[PDB]
């Protein structure tokens, strides 16, 4: 009859708002179309999203996902055209020096892969920006990366000059958005590459602090912890823009949504001693077992006190995580600059 | 331990005692006395726990003043000031049983990890406290203070640490500032909890504070706490309950029969049953997640200023000066 | 450039004009007008430089109010408050020629490197400024502010940087907070210098500030400076001169003939001659050393609070509100 | 006639006060007796300070000075009995990654040399303390070292536990001296070694940030930037105490004193186209050309405004220095712990 199970209860407008929020979630490998395109490879099957080429390697403990989104796939799934490399150590912990060491290697290799077509010379001027608010622990990735980057420049062949770096902080206090601020600098610096380091938001809490995502599509709008970034890309600016991000937070309503769906999934997987067996669990757990993640999120948006959307979720030791990742990202960028741009 | 809160006004017994009471009855049950009060925009909650209360509810015996401005925001200048006067007032009352003079020694302690935003209440308060004292011509040499941070890295528990200082400074009062975990998100950063019960075991963001009490080191220990986080599974349970209550009321006290076919049988369950199922099926890592306002760095500043100002106004007006 | 100071009341011409004047004469020389005044414990020094003054002394043409509490310490509550009212007052006067309304845009800029203690005046002031604004219910959306730190790391000079913001925010006033180098150590942290000449080239701890002026970006630029350091060779010269003056006076205006056999012929030299010999013989690294009070972190806090409070009291009383 | 040239002008008391201040200067290689004992080796000459054995090596750009002070020499020169290793790269700059790399090697080697006689096992509990006030740039050595030490523990075999570490900060705000505070912890931790990292004061400004001094005599009283340390040593505490210090400041009156003496020395060395030729320069420069550094300092103490003694002198980029040295000291300690105590 109706097309969506929530119709009659969740406003159609709120459902559409949530569909959009989820298409613009920071991890491309969390788009629904990308998770279907991975399952679909059972010796290759149709692929209803055609504008998605997905490579999948693995090198030690690092699982690599290379995704190219062409112009057709971008209109389909709502994410800028370009390349997305996601590196993931699922077992990673703060103490896991080896995993961090392996991620460092994979990061340097992916940095030249994604930048080979730029044809970078030992005469290129490279601008590194760490976005984030330093006093919000999981958002401090960017700024702490810039601090460590500046430190490592001393002990390194790389002269200052030909690599310039800034951590803009909360640029809104001065009357500019992070977009204009990075533009105001890139105009005078005239860089050949702009690398932006930022903290990202995941939907599944098990993703947090265990992945890097490198993309040549820049900083997408509505991204980051504050859900408030402006586009910073080769299109907005005229300079190639690479974003390196690590997922540090879940939005409070999104964490609720995945918990509810985890109840449904776990109960479903234990039938017969990750799909939801709606027919079996619906008499117990209700019609919303049939709903999609966005319908549940639209429900939460309507029903929860509004302060819920001002809340984030992060690990209790996310300050150790920030330190480990800020050191990983700065090191891979600098070793990449040494090996394959300046030496 | 389900639905863990550090606020005393959030334990089930105290929420029922509060509705037996305002339903102009008297019939309590635990053996705990609780007077309410409002002073302008501040809702004061005086709560007293005898030893009968203590073992019933699982909270130490003593006194619990809870101030709250429900519409408080960071820009709320007026809200923050009445909060401060009420804090000084509560501070003399809870300590008038103590008869402190200009010759008694007050040790102020800020607990918390500075690099975890909502946990910074403690150390940022000591910072601002320090600033105020040396901004004041008053020596305040009868006021010492410290923020020990993560004492674990030195191989000492926060209890031992505070005792090693208190053993040597030999104080007559110990005021501890610290951030609390709460159970309802809308309580976050809008209440202070003053109590002569000190710091209860397993309180805080990390759910792991050691007891710092009268009973733990032999000095009076008064805690000033701000609820700054909710634990992630606790938040999920409250949110699911809020879906139920909101949808039920919008239909026409939860109406389980009307919402059960959409939202399922657990619409009838208790908070503890919901929390037990989530504890069984969610990945363990949820236990390691906390939930906090995106503006929590601003909240830390505002509350660190409030608490330092209260302690110092109270010290110079009613214990020195 | 010998005996470099950033305070205008420390240039030789202004020290002679000040003794021609108080010796109840009039006969100046440069073409600069200088009224003195004291308001309680604050010594105010209004100084005006026309273009004749500008090229004589090597300081930009404009107005220079210099407030000073010679007995100021960090604990000096009263000293710090009169300082603040006098700062607001000086801020309306220096800006009453500007006719700013509730619709004009004020950009406040804190210069300095946060990790160099005495250079932190600027950024710590912006921090505290930010706190005060969002503590105030007033939006202050006509007040924007930034602390750019060490803009050099991004490949931009501080001048360009401030212009890239000012170009886009298009302000009507720019107030810059910054730490100054002085020439007499006993001036350190006891004066504010307000001036519509902005930030002179080569001022600051690093002796390397770019000009930020009316003439550099076309907006009014008012500097609020605190003298926080002395350059090391400058300090040596002043100290040697102090030996001479103290020993000479203790004998019975320096008495060169009496002290020359103990302290040598350079007892008769000028400050510039002494500084030239030191510049020739000392290792170059002296040029890279600064001198600052051991308590300078406390001073940064106190003055950052003062300056933020002045700017904001003045903005809401005399430009908004 | 009289024994001291300043007699009649400088009070005898102030001269004695300054003699003491200079015997208790942080760098043992700046004691007057130690500089004479080095010159004296012209194929060995008498040595009027007999309680001083001085080794002198050099390994790459690192100049090493090993000094042992026996009980006789300690009464003579006023510095605790024990060993002092001073490593120095005179050419060192913040950017000098190689010099820092060489200093790191020398530091690890000296750390086991000075600790061999302790017979440390993989079961020893080691306590590292970084003293200093973090908001006074050159004094931030200690605390920043502890931050970096804590970070490197994650990425390193060394479990936390068996190496505990604290940065006490300004312990006077709580009613304890840094002495009692380190005692209050060492009693409960019961360490087998206590390593203290602190910033030191030099007399010659050319020393700043170019040396490390490792000693088993602990933290001497009156040391550090504040001239206010309490003894923290094997004697005060009962646990062996090693101090690692780097000189970051000159006291303002002491900098004046060396400037004045530099005038006298430079003028003196250019006669005939580091002694002071008193007879030649005294008609020009005065009787105080004959005075000793302490007599000049005693003069300054009497004559200068008292705020002069509340002033310190540090390089304009001493924050980069703190970062480079805090990373050097933490790295050498941790590599020493790995190679020669736990692996």
């Amino acid at each position: 009859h109706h097309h969506h199970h929530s119709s009659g209860l969740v406003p159609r407008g709120s459902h559409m708002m949530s569909k959009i929020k989820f298409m613009r979630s920071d991890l491309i490998d969390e788009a629904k179309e990308v998770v279907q395109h991975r399952t679909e490879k059972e010796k290759d099957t149709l692929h209803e999203t055609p504008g998605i080429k997905m490579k999948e390697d693995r090198n030690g403990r690092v699982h690599i996902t290379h995704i190219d989104v062409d112009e057709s796939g971008a209109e389909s799934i709502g994410k800028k055209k370009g390349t997305y490399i996601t590196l993931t150590v699922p077992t990673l912990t703060v103490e896991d020096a080896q995993g961090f060491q392996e991620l460092n290697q994979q990061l340097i290799s992916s940095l030249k892969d994604i930048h080979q077509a730029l044809m970078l010379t030992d005469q290129s001027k490279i601008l590194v920006i760490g976005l984030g608010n330093r006093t919000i622990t999981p958002d401090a990735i960017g700024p702490v990366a810039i601090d460590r980057f500046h430190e490592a420049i001393f002990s390194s062949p790389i002269e200052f000059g030909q690599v310039v770096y800034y951590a803009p902080g909360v640029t809104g206090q001065t009357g500019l958005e992070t977009g204009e601020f990075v533009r105001a600098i890139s105009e005078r610096v005239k860089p050949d590459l702009i690398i932006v380091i930022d903290a990202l938001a995941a939907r599944n809490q098990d993703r947090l602090c265990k992945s890097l995502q490198i993309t040549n599509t820049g900083i997408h709008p509505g991204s980051g912890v504050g859900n408030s970034r402006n586009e910073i890309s080769f299109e907005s600016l005229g300079v190639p823009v690479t974003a390196i991000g690590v997922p540090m937070v879940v939005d409070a309503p999104v964490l609720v949504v995945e918990a509810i769906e985890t109840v449904f999934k776990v109960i479903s997987s234990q039938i017969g001693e990750e799909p939801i067996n709606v027919d079996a669990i619906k008499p117990i757990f209700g019609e919303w077992t049939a709903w999609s993640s966005e319908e549940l999120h639209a429900l939460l948006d309507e029903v929860l006190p509004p302060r819920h959307q001002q809340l984030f979720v992060t690990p209790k030791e996310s300050d150790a995580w920030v330190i480990m990742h800020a050191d990983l990202i700065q090191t891979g960028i600098l070793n990449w600059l040494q090996d394959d741009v300046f030496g």
Side-chain angles (χ1 to χ4, degrees), chain A:
Chain A
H1 35 63
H2 300 9
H3 181 253
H4 277 135
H5 305 285
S6 51
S7 312
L9 188 42
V10 172
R12 302 297 84 219
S14 316
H15 181 185
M16 298 309 96
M17 283 317 98
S18 286
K19 280 192 79 94
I20 302 160
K21 177 144 203 293
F22 277 38
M23 276 186 337
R24 307 201 333 179
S25 269
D26 296 336
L27 302 190
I28 190 135
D29 39 289
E30 280 192 321
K32 60 214 253 162
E33 291 72 16
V34 182
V35 168
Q36 174 161 280
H37 185 290
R38 185 196 298 279
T39 325
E40 261 170 333
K41 321 186 162 245
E42 295 136 327
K43 213 240 202 193
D44 210 301
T45 302
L46 89 160
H47 296 330
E48 263 298 76
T49 325
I52 288 185
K53 318 185 290 206
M54 161 158 323
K55 216 175 309 170
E56 294 190 58
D57 209 356
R58 165 157 209 274
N59 168 38
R61 316 174 47 204
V62 177
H63 306 212
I64 308 94
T65 279
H66 186 109
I67 286 173
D68 276 283
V69 162
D70 63 26
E71 203 165 40
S72 155
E75 280 71 337
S76 153
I77 82 176
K79 274 218 161 306
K80 290 273 295 314
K81 179 266 152 189
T83 310
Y84 300 78
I85 302 152
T86 283
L87 326 162
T88 295
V89 179
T91 37
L92 193 67
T93 72
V94 166
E95 310 232 347
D96 186 348
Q98 191 224 344
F100 271 96
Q101 197 33 52
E102 290 200 48
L103 261 165
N104 186 72
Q105 290 305 101
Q106 212 35 68
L107 168 62
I108 306 172
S109 153
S110 312
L111 272 174
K112 195 61 243 183
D113 291 359
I114 215 173
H115 286 102
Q116 201 314 285
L118 267 85
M119 301 301 172
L120 287 168
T121 87
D122 48 47
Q123 304 294 300
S124 36
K125 174 158 260 223
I126 296 207
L127 172 57
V128 184
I129 282 141
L131 304 169
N133 175 11
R134 193 189 312 262
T135 46
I136 292 287
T137 303
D139 201 30
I141 295 273
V144 172
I146 296 302
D147 301 341
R148 294 335 181 74
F149 195 65
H150 171 70
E151 284 165 38
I153 290 295
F154 299 156
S155 147
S156 163
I158 298 293
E159 65 296 314
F160 162 68
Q162 311 306 307
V163 304
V164 277
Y165 41 87
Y166 204 63
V170 188
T171 61
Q173 318 186 334
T174 204
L176 289 82
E177 321 164 334
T178 61
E180 326 178 51
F181 206 99
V182 173
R183 173 191 301 290
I185 285 179
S186 163
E187 277 164 2
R188 301 145 152 108
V189 171
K190 278 122 166 214
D192 302 302
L193 179 54
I194 296 183
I195 299 181
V196 186
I197 310 174
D198 197 23
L200 309 169
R203 279 153 60 196
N204 183 243
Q205 60 81 41
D206 264 348
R207 306 297 315 258
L208 294 190
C209 320
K210 313 229 193 58
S211 318
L212 295 191
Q213 166 188 276
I214 304 104
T215 174
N216 47 21
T217 67
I219 295 301
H220 304 195
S223 77
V225 163
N227 282 303
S228 49
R229 290 281 174 239
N230 311 76
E231 196 197 8
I232 295 173
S233 63
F234 167 63
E235 284 78 15
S236 66
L237 273 206
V239 194
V241 179
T242 295
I244 311 171
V246 51
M248 302 295 296
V249 304
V250 181
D251 279 332
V254 164
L255 177 124
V256 180
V257 162
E258 298 293 308
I260 293 178
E261 294 196 309
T262 288
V263 178
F264 302 162
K265 288 177 200 178
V266 173
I267 291 330
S268 278
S269 76
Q270 281 154 4
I271 301 173
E273 201 254 23
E274 259 297 349
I276 289 172
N277 183 327
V278 173
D279 283 332
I281 67 161
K282 190 213 253 167
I284 299 332
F285 276 106
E287 276 165 40
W288 66 348
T289 56
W291 297 12
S292 63
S293 322
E294 308 85 295
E295 294 164 284
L296 295 160
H297 186 268
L299 179 66
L300 294 188
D301 178 66
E302 290 299 305
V303 152
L304 291 193
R307 195 182 196 189
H308 275 268
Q309 188 73 48
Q310 305 325 308
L311 301 173
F312 67 92
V313 195
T314 204
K316 282 172 191 177
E317 57 199 6
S318 60
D319 54 343
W321 280 117
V322 166
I323 276 294
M324 293 311 275
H325 277 287
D327 206 64
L328 158 57
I329 295 162
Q330 155 271 320
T331 285
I333 293 181
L334 203 64
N335 285 117
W336 168 64
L337 284 184
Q338 281 159 1
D339 303 354
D340 315 316
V341 169
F342 295 109

